[PDB]
Amino acid sequence: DLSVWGMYQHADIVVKCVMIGLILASVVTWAIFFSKSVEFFNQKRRLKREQQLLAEARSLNQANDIAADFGSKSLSLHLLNEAQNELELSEGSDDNEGIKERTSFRLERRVAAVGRQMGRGNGYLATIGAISPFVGLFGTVWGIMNSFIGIAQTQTTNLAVVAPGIAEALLATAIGLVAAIPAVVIYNVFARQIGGFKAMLGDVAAQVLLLQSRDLDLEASAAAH
Amino acid sequence: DLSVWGMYQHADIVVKCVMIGLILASVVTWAIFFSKSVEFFNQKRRLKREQQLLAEARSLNQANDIAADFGSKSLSLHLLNEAQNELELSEGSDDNEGIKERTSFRLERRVAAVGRQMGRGNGYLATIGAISPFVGLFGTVWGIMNSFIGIAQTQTTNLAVVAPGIAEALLATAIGLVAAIPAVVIYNVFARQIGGFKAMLGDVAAQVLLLQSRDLDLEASAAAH
Amino acid sequence: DLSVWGMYQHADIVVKCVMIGLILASVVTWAIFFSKSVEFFNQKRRLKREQQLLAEARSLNQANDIAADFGSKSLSLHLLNEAQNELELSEGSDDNEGIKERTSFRLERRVAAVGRQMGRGNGYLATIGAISPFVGLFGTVWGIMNSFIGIAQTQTTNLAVVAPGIAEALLATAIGLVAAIPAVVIYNVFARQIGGFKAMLGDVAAQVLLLQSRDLDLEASAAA
Amino acid sequence: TDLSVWGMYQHADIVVKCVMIGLILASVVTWAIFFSKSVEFFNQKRRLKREQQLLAEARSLNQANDIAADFGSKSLSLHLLNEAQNELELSEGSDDNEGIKERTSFRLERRVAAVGRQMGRGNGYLATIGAISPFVGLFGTVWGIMNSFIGIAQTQTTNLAVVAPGIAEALLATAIGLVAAIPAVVIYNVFARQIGGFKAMLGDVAAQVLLLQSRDLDLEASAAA
Amino acid sequence: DLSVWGMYQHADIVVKCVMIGLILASVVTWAIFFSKSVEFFNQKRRLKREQQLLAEARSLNQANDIAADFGSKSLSLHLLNEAQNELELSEGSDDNEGIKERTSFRLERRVAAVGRQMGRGNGYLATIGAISPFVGLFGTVWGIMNSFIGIAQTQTTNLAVVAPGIAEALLATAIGLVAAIPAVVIYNVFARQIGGFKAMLGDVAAQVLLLQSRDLDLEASAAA
Amino acid sequence: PWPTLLSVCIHGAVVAG
Amino acid sequence: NGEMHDINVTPFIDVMLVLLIIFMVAAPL
Amino acid sequence: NGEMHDINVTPFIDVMLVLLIIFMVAAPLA
Questions:
Q1: Where on the phi/psi map is residue A155: left (φ > 0), alpha (ψ -120 to 50), or beta?
Q2: E192 and H1 in contact by Cβ < 8 A?
Q3: Which residues does E117 contact at the CB level (< 8 Å), separation at least 6?
Q4: How far apart are CA C148 and CA C169, in angstroms?
Q5: Could you count the other beta carbons within 10 Å of the beta carbon of residue E9?
Q6: With helix as H, strand as E and coil as C, how does chain A read?
Q7: Hey, what's the torsion of the CAs at A159, A165, A168, A169, to 10 degrees?
Q8: List of residues 6+ apart from C195 with CB closer than 8 A
Q9: What is the DSSP string of C152-210?
Q10: In which domain of life is the source organism classified (chain F)?
Q11: Contact G11 C176 (CB under 8 A)
């Protein structure tokens, strides 16, 4: 006998399929971890730096002039463009309160849309970490059946007869856990990172709404005098 | 004997009706999966194209012109009609905020109603996922009972004489998880699909609501000139 | 002997008590299902027909005239006469958005109150569904423990000796499963039916607010 | 020589003795919390029902004060009514009523949330006991299983009849583990339902106070015409 | 001689690494408990005192003077500054509904930020509470699997030579649960402490909005 | 800090034997 | 939403306990 | 809150499966 390979290659076809299916579920969870984590760090780092620059701005005109040199797929420059666009499309209005409600509603939609987009892969993580225990368990039940089928076929209880069934049950449990544990860790790490990032983006969005709203009220006051 | 079909053949009526009831729950789970997935893919593929058109609109009258050829049963056409219907039902009133408020309220309900209608069949997937382990296990427990009550009267000593019954019993929980795991996976997938689609439809509802609120303020300013 | 009754009568006091506890839970479940379903089906069927007749209305007084022959127990008539009560209680007032907000708030409380009363029994269904498996597990463990305590009495053993002791320990979980299975099914059936009922009642209340809000704006606009 | 439910605890290892004492202490505190909380919940619910059904006839906030004045200082509805009266008392210089209506809505909402949060005070024990007592049982269980196999490893006997007493102690630790778990998780759910029902009912009284104040303010404003 | 220290000294390298993994997780959960327990005790003690000081105040200018000697890390002083700063940035304007809205939005952002920033450690506690039973389980499954392949070859029909391997394996799941139980306890304690603290801070923020809301309406009335 | 050090100190007292 | 759709498999513990006792009694003969 | 307030199933199942496998090696070995 051999420590893992010999034990695996002797296993029943149903357990071989469960083992391979869980190993594929393992490699996809590590692939989407590395693949999204390097994007996520870059989006967190850029959004932090943009927030640190915008934090000084005292009019929406000044907030455009400081933000305009940001990259072409900047999140903050997208929100400043969105609020500036709601204003330029409304230029015939005398009611500023309608510009405030429409801008608030439009930025809330765009913050939520980036929140959904940043979650793209999480369906795999949340599913695999919830169901791979039960997929492992099904593999154990098949190993347990194969142990009793062994006993029934030889009509004896000798350890050699149950050995393949318990070997299958051990491997199916072990790989079931090896699929589960990373997926539960990585899902919690991204749930925390999404909460932090989506809150930072909501804080930048709130700064744009504050700054636009204050400017419209000062422009209205300066006309009324 | 000593194979999944040969042991199903030599099982207990109640264990047979469990195995049959589980296979029926499995084929229903796949039937609803293909049916619902083919509907959601078509409703998403449609609505994406409707949004890519209406994203170019700049007034509500232009949005009605752009929407004029869309399919009768299209969700975006329905919403444009929902907003325009409130605008003609309200024709005698100069209270614009009222019109915005009543329109916002109507569109909100219709979006919730479409999202709820799109979720019609999911109670089967939830029920099958929650219940099928229990019944599969009722198959195991009854199969163990109706074999151990035999050895209690037959004064048996060889585990082998009962190992066939134990294998037939454990097969019922194997079949149990085989119905359960697809149903939980698919229910979690459709919950994410409906969340994504209901958000995307809420985005198309926001596009018409903004177009109306914009045009009301522009028309009020043109009257106040 | 071989019989389910005989092995119940033979079983230990703790596991007999667990079997009776789970049988009484199975009975209540079914008592709740028949008690709820006959009332809920009739009230669902009632409310749908009210919505059919109201969906054509164009002013709140016309909706009252449509509702005037509905029974005093009609939820749609409860909502309509409540919106007419918030008008009559402040008739000597011209704060239109005040009347709208007070009405919207009353109908929100009423729809929530009816929905909350509609769900009255579900706490038992959810609990019996989630927890009966663990009561079955306690019953079994205790029987399995008692069987090892049986083995501790003597060096002699054979599986024919423990067979009835493990059979009563199995029967305790068989009763646990037969009690849990209906409760999960029935809980989900009512959770889906309640979601539809909440929506229908909410859309009737939405129609009442829309009727009021238009006819109130149109009346105010007659001063032009 | 012989053993019983108590005699098995009397011969048990000090680690699992300490676990069993832990569960019995968790049992007596979860029942002491239940009887204490239940007697409070019944009296609070019965009081609030009588106070609401008696307030239901009030036509102005001035009449609602005269109805409530003899409720007693522990009354939730007299507290809420005072909160509402005190906002008028502090706002006496205001011509603006919409601000008073808003501030009162805000205060009474925070009071309703505060009373709901205050009724939950003991629930941390019920939730924690229900979550950990299974695990804490298993630990005792596993420790008993270890001590049985250590007994073989330290004495070189191979007869499973010496294992049977040791694993009986282990399964007893699981049994008492569930006896602490099940009441706690049932009672936590029951109270979570009773808190939600009471908090919603108190919100119905709060809505009546807001409606009375809002209506009588609008009449007081109308009287200036 | 196979005592807990001897079993660790006589275990497979993979399962030794599982013991060290859970022991380091046990260290970090207790380090988080002692680190956050003093933080909650100090921050909740201070905020309760600041609330009882401010509850007496009757205008925003009085609240600013009452809080003027609070330490630079004072959360109530930070919220009063956040409100005062929206007045001084708005000075050239008279949209009082605008000032009230902008202030409300700033304070709710800040209270949400303090709540989020104060639940810093919980990602470890929730993760360790979920996964520590399972990494302990992986350790025992591996230990059993080694002991089995051990009887697969060098076949030894004696039970007594595998019993050490069975105990060494089981110890990995015992150490798993000893790490898991504190993590679930400490997590619930801090979930409840944060819930109470976040609501207390929300009531301080609500008093600032109410004081400002009265003051602006009173000033606008006195200006008539 | 002193919380990290105190944690390894109580684990040092508990691991002894 | 109030519906329940997640797996509970706890009665399989009962089967494992029953398997454990029958191996304990029968297997060494 | 989000306070853990429920009996999670899978640690319980997996440790009981581990105990079953332990008696499936030990008992036929004896």
A1: left
A2: yes
A3: none
A4: 12
A5: 11
A6: CCCCHHHHHHCCHHHHHHHHHHHHHHHHHHHHHHHHHHHHHHHHHHHHHHHHHHCCCCCHHHHHHHHCCCCCCCHHHHHHHHHHHHHHCCCCCCCHHHHHHHHHHHHHHHHHHHHHHHCCCHHHHHHHHHHHHHHHHHHHHHHHHHHHHHHHHHCCCCHHHHHHHHHHHHHHHHHHHHHHHHHHHHHHHHHHHHHHHHHHHHHHHHHHHHHHHHHHHHHHHHHHC
A7: -90
A8: B116, G1, G2, G3
A9: TT-S---HHHHHHHHHHHHHHHHHHHHHHHHHHHHHHHHHHHHHHHHHHHHHHHHHHHH
A10: Bacteria
A11: yes
* Domains of chain C: total: 1
Tokens representing residue B57 in the block: 């609109």
Any idea which residue has 């009632």 for tokens? C46
List residues in chain B touching C: CB distance below 8 A.
89-90, 92-95, 98, 101-102, 105-106, 109, 112-113, 116, 123, 126-127, 130-131, 134-135, 137-138, 141-142, 144-145, 148-149, 151-153, 155-157, 159, 162
Closest CA to D79 of D181, D202, D166, D170: D202
B203 is in which domain, residue-wise? Answer: 1-225
Contact residues on chain A for B170, CB-CB shorter than 8 A: 141, 144-145, 148
Residue F12 burial class via C-beta count within 10 angstroms: exposed 0-12, middle 13-18, buried 19 and up = exposed
Interface residue of B22, B82, B88, B93 to substitute, partner C, most C CBs within 10 Å: B93
Contact criterion met (CB below 8 Å) for B176 and B137: yes
Strand, coil or helix: F17:
coil
Q: Which chains does A contact via 3+ CB–CB distances below 8 A? A: B, E, G, H
User: CB burial class (10 A; 0-12, 13-18, 19+) of residue E52?
Assistant: exposed
d(CA A23, CA A140): 16
Contact call for residues B115 and B43 (beta carbons, < 8 A): no
D164 touches chain G (CB under 8 A): yes
- Which residue in A173, A180, A181 sits closest to A142, CA to CA? A173
C-alpha distance from residue D16 to each of A152, B168, C134, D167, D183 (Å): 39, 38, 22, 12, 22
Query: How many whole angstroms separate alpha carbon B112 and alpha carbon A210?
Result: 30
**Which runs of E-coded beta strand occur in C35-188?**
none
Q: What is the CA radius of gyration of chain B?
A: 29
Number of Cβ within 10 Å of residue B55's Cβ equals 11
Angle A144-A145-A150 from CA coordinates, rounded to 5°: 100
CA atoms within 13 A on the CB side of B113: 16
CA atoms within 13 A on the CB side of G23: 25
Over the range C191-219, which residues count as b (16 or more CB within 10 Å of their CB) and which as e?
bbbbbebbebbbbbbbbbbbbbbbbbbbe
Kindly give, in sequence order, each residue whose CB lies less than 8 Å from that of residue B220, ignoring residues fewer than 6 positions away.
Answer: A95, B96
| Tokens found for residue B79 | 């919403």
- The 3-state DSSP class for residue E94 equals coil
* Documented resolution in Å: 3.2
Q: Which residues in chain C are closer than 8 Å to D218, comparing Cβ atoms?
A: 90, 93, 95, 98
Show residues of chain H in contact with D138, CB under 8 Å.
Answer: 11-12, 15
CA distance E10 to A17: 35
Nearest-angstrom CA–CA distance, E188 and E192: 6
Distance CA E124, CA E136 (A): 17
Nearest residue to A100 (alpha-carbon basis) of A110, A86, A81, A111: A86
Q: How many CA atoms lie within 13 A of A151 on its CB side?
A: 27
DSSP, collapsed to helix, strand or coil, labels residue A172 as: helix
Pull the structure tokens for residue E33.
């408990």
d(CA E90, CA E83): 11
